[PDB]
Design a protein around this ligand. Structure first.
Ligand code: SF4
Length: 266
């Protein structure tokens, strides 16, 4: 007889509240994405996939497949083999050439080759299993998908977050991964870093004391409650939508799935 826990937090949720990408932040976008997502006219705009999402999904799959085929060399062209597995010829050509650049970069810098792989996601999986956290009088689910976990010589776990595109690294995501690792890999030292598969730019190695992670857990617990309160307030009175999820029209609208239905779209 375990009650369902509705409260949850994740980097994705956090980013929809607190955004280098602050200019496109819009709370009304989150209102559509989370509070109105079942409305037919909203659901149909959410069922369309993005090019950057596409490049990212294929990039993760591409690293996974390149690595897999490289374990026991077969003498073949691993870049061409991986491109064939990914069916890049069926993608928009912009997408193809970016994934091919990512594969060329990996071929020249096979950063997984000699390493002890704890986790390497293919990118095709769904949401991770939740981590159930009690913080004060709140219980919430933490969702954190780790693209890559390596084990270093001294036993330290290295969480690597793969980036593509022109995005800047958001170190809050690294701290989310380090918090999650304290639950997934208990009593194991961990470090986190970012690596842009396309530009080969890397962040520093990020570590977090137990105190810093505890305080981030506090912040995520607060987020989980605020989000449920936003939803409750909207469901209690739909006419409060605009006040609960205020619009920020302008630059934000250029990359918003809901411009065709939003009353404030520019
Ligand atoms: S169309 Fe513009 S104002 Fe409306 S939700 Fe999207 S970004 Fe916000």
């Amino acid at each position: 007889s375990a009650p369902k826990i509705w409260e949850f937090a994740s980097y994705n949720l956090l980013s929809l509240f607190s955004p280098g990408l602050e200019h496109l932040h819009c709370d009304m976008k989150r209102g559509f994405t989370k509070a109105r997502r079942r409305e037919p006219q909203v659901a149909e705009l959410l069922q369309k996939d993005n090019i950057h999402q596409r490049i990212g999904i294929l990039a993760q799959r591409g690293i996974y497949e390149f690595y897999q085929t490289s374990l026991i060399a077969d003498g073949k062209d691993a870049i061409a083999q991986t491109a064939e597995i990914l069916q890049l010829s069926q993608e928009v050509d912009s997408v193809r050439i970016k994934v091919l650049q990512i594969l060329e970069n990996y071929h020249h810098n096979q950063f997984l080759a000699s390493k002890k792989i704890i986790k390497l996601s293919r990118g095709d999986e769904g949401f991770p299993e939740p981590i159930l956290i009690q913080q004060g009088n709140n219980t919430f689910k933490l969702y954190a998908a780790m693209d890559c976990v390596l084990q270093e010589e001294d036993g330290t776990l290295h969480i690597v977050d793969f980036k593509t595109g022109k995005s800047d690294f958001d170190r809050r995501q690294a701290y989310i991964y380090l918090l999650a690792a304290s639950y997934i890999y208990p009593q194991q030292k961990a470090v986190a870093s970012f690596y842009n598969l396309e530009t080969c730019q890397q962040s520093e190695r990020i570590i977090a004391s137990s105190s810093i992670l505890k305080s981030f857990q506090v912040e995520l617990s607060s987020l989980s409650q605020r989000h449920q309160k936003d939803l409750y307030r909207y469901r209690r009175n739909f006419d409060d939508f605009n006040r609960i999820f205020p619009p920020n029209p302008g630059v934000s609208c250029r990359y918003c799935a809901f411009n065709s239905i939003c009353k404030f779209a520019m």
